[PDB]
């Protein structure tokens, strides 16, 4: 009865490397720059993934741009939490196979408290024992979690497509669960986990803006496409021009 599970398994992007030189001594600038680079190349793959998500390419192109601009941070934080879970049991932040943050790096990064919050989020994957299929469904849903306060070009269609992917998450749970009561509870837990991303991503957007503004004094380069996305929509997010779409 789940109709998207194998599609989502086949369009899932491969793992991206940072290219960080893990022999240099860590600095704030080296760590945040490396993260920006990794972010750029992950964003390229997130765009190819979003384009392959059934129904997405049927939204107006301006809505596709809006959705990616708004949700890239949430999608990438969620994917990174999943990687941390599957590879180091959420003990360290697994940005890339060649950029793992231990405690020390979290301190040098200058964004320690945000790193701790993101590691707590990965621990939620550990406690819930999130399966790969649930992960893929929820990550697809994260592309439908934020919209402009005035809405999209075709709101009606976005609403129906979002409802369709919510239903798919439920179908995956009931395909895997035991009882109707247990699967209802599981849906509740996993939509709460999705909802809990929003305050984290808000804080991360604030930090991102702070860094973007200070990029010259801090020697933190932002690559081209990240710069254009950030300066395009992060001020609007911080100004309250967007509205989270809650799942629970």
């Amino acid at each position: 009865i789940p109709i998207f599970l194998s599609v989502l398994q086949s369009i899932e992007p491969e793992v991206v490397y940072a290219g960080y030189d893990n022999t240099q001594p860590d600095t704030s600038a080296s760590l945040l720059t490396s993260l920006n680079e990794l972010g750029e190349r992950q964003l390229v793959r997130v765009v190819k993934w979003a384009k392959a998500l059934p129904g997405f390419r049927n939204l107006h192109v301006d809505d596709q741009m809006t959705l990616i601009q708004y949700s890239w941070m949430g999608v990438m934080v969620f994917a990174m939490g999943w990687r941390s879970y599957k590879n180091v049991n959420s003990r360290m932040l697994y940005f890339a196979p060649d950029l793992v943050f231990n405690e020390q790096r979290m301190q040098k990064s200058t964004m320690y408290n945000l790193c701790v919050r993101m590691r707590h989020l990965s621990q939620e994957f550990v406690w819930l024992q999130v399966t790969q299929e649930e992960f893929l469904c929820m990550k697809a849903l994260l592309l439908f979690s934020i919209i402009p306060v005035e809405g999209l070009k075709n709101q009606k269609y976005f609403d129906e497509l979002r409802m369709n992917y919510i239903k798919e998450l439920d179908r995956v749970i009931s395909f895997q669960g035991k009882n109707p009561t247990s699967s209802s509870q599981r849906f509740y837990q996993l939509t709460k986990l999705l909802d809990s991303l929003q305050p984290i991503v808000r804080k991360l957007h604030q930090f991102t803006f702070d860094l973007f503004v200070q990029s010259q004094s801090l020697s933190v380069e932002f690559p081209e496409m990240m710069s254009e996305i950030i300066s395009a929509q992060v001020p609007k997010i911080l100004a309250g021009m967007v509205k989270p779409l809650l799942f629970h």
Binding site: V44, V47, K48, K51, V61, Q64, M65, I68, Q69, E224, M225, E228, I229
Partner: peptide, 9 residues
């Protein structure tokens, strides 16, 4: 324009 370029591919 870069995001729009990736979308139009």
């Amino acid at each position: 324009a870069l995001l729009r370029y990736l979308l139009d591919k």
